[PDB]
Symmetry: D2
Subunit: 492 residues, 4 copies
């Protein structure tokens, strides 16, 4: 998911909409924008679909005000495509809205405590609604009005002591302003920027990625530190405060592999440069372990891997060729009467340039392997196009464990690498050869850009969850959620 918040000195509706169109790759299932108007009331529009489809002229006219936040959703366990999207809202205390990218590992316990100690009802199964209600509950411990920046930071700190997981959040409190805060491990991405309108007026904004600041002409300031919170009043006054104990930087390594945009700088690291480095590492590993193989050309599987594969071909002294063309426009399959509903294809998303595989031993490069379904079909397409030997290299290491910090992954059972060695995975997908990036190499590829990061969040790769609260029981719990989300989406 992706979030954006803008505390401006002029209408923000178009700007939030614009920031969301460049963060669209973070989620295309739903979008939402909520602003505070001249009357200190929230105006909201959120619905399923791409940003460009969710917000029509009439909704834009309603989104009045100089402060607002937005969200684009990537369906996850608990937040199915059929469920209410973000931002979520509460009317007490004061009126609070919040958008979130992440996941709370203790959501269920929090929901119990909210119900039993505060009588606060959670209407969805989204941990973002629960996150909003914990914060609201903490803000409700104040008598004096209005709240000082100290009370808002105190509430966020109290919140950080209750919730556990990963989270990049942005919220607005009526009559106060905008807050943004990050988990104590710095797992989910969040940057801060500003835009000077004149000598006395400066607008602020926070976004999941720096590209949202670039597209609007905002100057990059810095990443919001782990555990840090940012508060911008109504009036445009900026406050920042460390709101967690023992904060450390463990950025999600997955964002760098393919999730984030290449033009973003996350925690001082260029995603693009980190990706070129991955190709450098993978190229060196291939040149070492596959010295005797006959490889005629390196062909990336679009689109993230094109640069990675380019670097590999350079290292290997082999030609790089566009063997696969990604279909920019993909349509749906219709359930028609009498007609046989045939095949779920990768051919809908990808086309093979026939001339580029014919009688060649091809090294295909992909960003990662999850279910293994697509790679299987892609290798098949290479053979149909006349390829002799088909090898596959993965920019990311084996993905064996589920992500519980915000990135959507299927259950451990549906992960081809889970419980399997490289050769078996290779035989299943039917490749002549399979090679994965070493985790320590991925780490160095990214770390080389910012050596200050000591450790990243690498759970999908090594099964080590930094929050130390993940076990099979919890993962099974998450699966039951997916089962309920399925029944709901199936229904629609």
């Amino acid at each position: 998911c992706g979030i954006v918040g803008i505390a401006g000195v002029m209408p923000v509706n178009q700007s939030i909409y614009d920031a969301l169109t460049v963060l669209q790759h973070r989620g295309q299932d739903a979008a939402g924008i909520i602003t505070i108007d001249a009357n200190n009331c929230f105006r909201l529009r959120k619905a399923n679909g791409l940003v460009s489809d969710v917000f029509e002229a009439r909704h834009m006219q309603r989104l009045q005000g100089n402060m607002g936040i937005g969200h684009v959703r990537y369906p996850t366990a608990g937040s199915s495509s059929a469920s209410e999207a973000q931002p979520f809202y509460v009317n007490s205390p004061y009126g609070i809205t919040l958008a979130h990218n992440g996941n709370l590992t203790n959501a269920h316990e929090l929901r119990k405590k909210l119900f039993e100690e505060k009588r606060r009802h959670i209407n969805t199964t989204s941990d973002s609604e629960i996150l909003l209600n914990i914060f609201a509950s903490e803000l409700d411990n104040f008598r004096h009005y209005p709240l000082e920046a100290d009370n808002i930071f105190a509430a966020i700190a109290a919140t950080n002591r209750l919730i556990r997981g990963a989270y990049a959040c942005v919220a607005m409190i009526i009559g106060h302003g905008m807050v943004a805060f990050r988990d104590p491990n710095g797992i989910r991405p969040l940057v801060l920027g500003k835009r000077d309108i004149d000598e006395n007026r400066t607008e602020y904004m926070v976004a999941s990625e720096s590209v949202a600041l670039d597209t609007l002409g905002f100057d990059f300031l810095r990443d919001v530190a782990p555990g840090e919170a940012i508060y911008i009043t109504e009036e445009g006054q900026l406050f920042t405060r460390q709101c967690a104990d023992n904060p450390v930087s463990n950025p999600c390594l997955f964002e760098y592999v393919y999730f984030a945009r290449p033009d973003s700088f996350i925690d001082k690291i260029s995603v693009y440069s980190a990706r070129v480095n991955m190709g450098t590492k993978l190229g060196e590993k291939i040149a070492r372990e596959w010295e005797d193989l006959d490889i005629d050309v390196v062909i990336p599987i679009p689109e993230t891997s094109c640069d990675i594969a380019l670097e590999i071909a350079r290292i290997l002294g082999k030609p790089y060729r566009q063997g696969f063309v990604k279909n920019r426009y993909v349509g749906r399959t219709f359930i028609m009467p009498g007609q046989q509903l045939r095949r779920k294809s990768v051919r809908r998303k990808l086309n093979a340039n026939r001339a580029e595989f014919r009688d060649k031993n091809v090294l295909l490069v992909d960003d990662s392997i999850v279910r293994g379904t697509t790679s299987e079909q892609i290798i098949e397409m290479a053979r149909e196009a006349g390829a002799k030997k088909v090898y596959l290299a993965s920019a990311a290491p084996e993905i064996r464990f589920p992500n519980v910090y915000g990135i959507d992954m299927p259950s451990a059972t549906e992960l081809i690498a889970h419980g399997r060695e490289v050769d078996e995975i290779r035989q299943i997908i039917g490749a002549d050869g399979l090679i994965f990036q070493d985790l320590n190499d991925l780490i160095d590829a990214v770390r080389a850009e910012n050596p200050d990061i000591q450790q990243f969040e690498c759970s999908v790769f090594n099964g080590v969850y930094v929050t130390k609260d993940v076990d099979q029981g919890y993962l099974d719990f998450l699966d039951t959620l997916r089962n309920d989300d399925a029944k709901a989406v199936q229904r629609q």
Copy 2:
């Protein structure tokens, strides 16, 4: 514009819809699909928007039948977003529908003749409706039923003697089959493919590009020859015939530069290879002519120039780096009362990776320069991202003339290269250096993929029009069509706003 026609043995709606999705890059303004159902009647669904938005389940349900044609629209003079989309239709003789990618240079005269001689009314300003009416009138000359293949070819031949310009068409005649034909100069693209089902049951298909055959699992057979017509009966039989007097192969060179998909083979030429060859040529030209220049990096302006720039970087022995990222998703700019700090037009399209320009003499590579407006903006974006020297190389030679064969290009006075030297253009766009592909190089780059083609359609580059009927009176008439088109689009916006 892109066209597709499938004569199958099983339901074609999903397949036509899928073929259009991979031809979607030829026009995103409107889309249309028409089929012949089991009762020998047309079923149609066409409207503005992408294929994925135009056709919903309720529309697909009505598009029944085993034969059908499709079209995606790129708006051009005489066919604005506001006007009626293709495919077009007429009910006599027989019931005929047609889809066309191209442009008739004698549309006006044809419309007058149609009115005076046949009393056939043309409801839109689209020459594609006129083409259909000439075809329909020629088919009305037979007095025996059903028509024989020879009759249908005779009609296409009569049509070709009457019409002038460029065209790739696919049509359907109720009770007979699907026909496809191409102009006598092979200007517009059109290929034929097949899919065997069993002994003497093959499905046939025609499309603007081979990627449409690929995606549906059809075996590519060959390009429809210039002036040739193909005819596939409802019973699945194939017939073809040369329907032009002196057919020549003069493929539009523009398709190769950026309009078609790189994974397509147009007249035996791989679009991808041709573009790689375009990089080899432009890189050697730069090596020769810009030898004294220090360029630190080669940066493509996405998306067409990525491989071209890679090749250029390879010839120059300079690094290739992704400096610009094209925003895959662009939204609408709503006209709100007092839009305070508007987001820059260029930023809507692209985003610069600051790190890739800082303190660097950069060489940018774009597919072409038309108006020159966005070029000046991209150059500015690079200096803003920290570049020192900003050079611009264009994979296409100077674009100085309007295209009247189906590719939408502004008028001659709107083209920045028109009436200007390279150094004048350079000054206007603000580059430290500007270099264009030489036309003969572009020609060799594409021809290298198939030496049989000796002459390409180059009018936008050299002002030479093969139909030899392009004069100022005609150009001016096209400008008139464009102005009326604009009025119709402006009106449509007027109360879309007032309705609020």
Copy 3:
């Protein structure tokens, strides 16, 4: 179905739209409006739904011009909700559009002739498209431009010799004007009105009913005579001509019973007065025949019978009371998995005021009895609301035959009165008593308003068809059309459900 045509001197879109809203009671299935713009081209917007839903601002913007026609559809055999709505169109000769309320009894044969002789394809199963094609073919017989009024009338006359059945039509011919014409037997309704603007600048209009002229402030001139045609040129000139061999006035008697609006004057007969007269006749019949019965109150089954029942209550010297209220708003019944306790079909339509039936012998009055299903349900509703005796009186005589002139009625075997005595029908519907209007009384009731009409169209009542071409082969063919129509509507529902 209802039609409207306005030949004005200022924009007609809003006016046509308003005229259809007051003709909306003649069909709520679909609606269509087409105009001729300043460039002599048609602009059209037609779709399923009420007028208020079909035409939005963006559609009205495109419907430019000072002349246009409109149509609202009631679905009938050959024209299901699924099929294409009116008005229909053809591009040759000239560009002709037409809207029709009625039915051609020789549609099949006409379609065959059109195919064989003219190679004119009919895309739908609507005889209105066929009618347009016969008209179009007759207009293709002239070799001088423009056509003279006399030519256009000659074509309508040729058409009338070819077609059989009932029809009220309004059409437009590009470059000439708007025409309107009525069948030789004056079966379907059609009136002419005008609106003066200044010296020699009058706007003309035709519509199915006079309430459409009223609402737009047009001066009612007169009914279009049977077999007559009206022609209004673009320049505002009026011409008329008798285009039938032996025109007779045989107005559909059904329009009077309940189909038309009470504030309309059809062939000099006020619909309202005729219905009041229908009450006078039925009340005197009841007084004479049900003299020994104790009836406490007269209760109409809304909405057509309110004034009829009032009149009946007046003749019987019994109180009139609103026992049933018709639910102005009816919703959709969604097909949900396991719809536990479904709301009764009759309750969706009506609601009973419990107080008005309790311990009372009630006399209910309905406009007619077709299938008899809803009648049995209303009777049940009354007993449930506490009635003791429940008698039913029908303003229309027994409905025993199908209508093939434009009014949608089920087949003969589906009509409860078909092959049954009044007492048998009574037993089936469960009334304590049942009484029908006598046909000669219904006739006198309407004729009293204009003694000049000596014969009405009564086929649904007496099986006598004026066109004398209605046999079982034809009836069976209509049943075939209805079945195919049902399949098309069923299919449309199938994935509307599956899409969920």
Copy 4:
């Protein structure tokens, strides 16, 4: 506005939808349905438009559960067509939703107290949102779980002591059930019904009018008494409790004139019979004050007046004729480019049967006169149709004062009878004669059906507001609200 609530033993979505289609005349601007699902979560759909347009198959599929409430909105001051419709919702305590027909005369003060004492934010300008928040606030004073019926009644009683005005309300509290309650003056309508499914299962429902019970096959039980509250648990157990001091019956007299359906029985009075009685009274007044006038026929102005006029013609021994036909289908007027936007007409809503006015002195009957605009045009139409003398009789007395109890009326300035005598009103609308029903006659017409009612709510007629808290200051306050609603709707 109209409300409905159904506590059933099987899905209620279609039934609530159906009940709302027969209460559609109470408001056509927006509709909303909210149900509690098998998971104890609310599922909601509300939007502008008729019920048949607001609820599509997909929304119906989402509205799962055996308990739910609905609302159809009639735009009023504070709740413009552009504002969020009902039912409103709050997440604490427990989760509460509420639909309301009425108006709180002390809304502004309540909103201040809610903000200052509870930090509860009101996002709309609707007093129904404020009503919901007062109730929620009162329900929040409980420690033990779940709430007993006594606590729910205590909260409603505490609520009745704070709010003032008129209100017929229905709400649902998650994990508890459905509540319905009426103001202490019995101004707004509300009935209770039941449906026996079997020996052990009985469903309950409440609606603004009895027609909603009839259409669903529910048996009428009784009107909910003034100040009374009804509570139905989840489990189908019914509780009732008087929750106000000094409750009295002052039903809104206006509902009977034209607002309610004729087939409804409100407070034991048949609306239909009360209307026939109005014609009896008005007929007697005309026969007495207009003895010497030449009247040829009585013509009602559709549709409510047809019966009233029928009774008048009977009393007067004059013929009743359908001179006016109401156009059942009315369309909109389009703002087109270049075209002159002409006339706002009554001809769009009404057609004159020409033959029925020609050379006659006509007595037109209408249900009431507010702005006087339409009557003016109607009389004009009668003259155009050839009428000689045109007289007008109003079933209701002069409407001189604004209604602040739920019925939408324009400000006192826009009421033709405000500050004007009959003759002046007559000259303005251009009638040859004008006669209004006497208030005491209207009272007797309605009261004759149920003599137990001593006094009705008659404010629009006499300017006496039973809640004793209405003065010019307040009425001016209401006008500023209309001005803000206007700017909002104008905007859309």
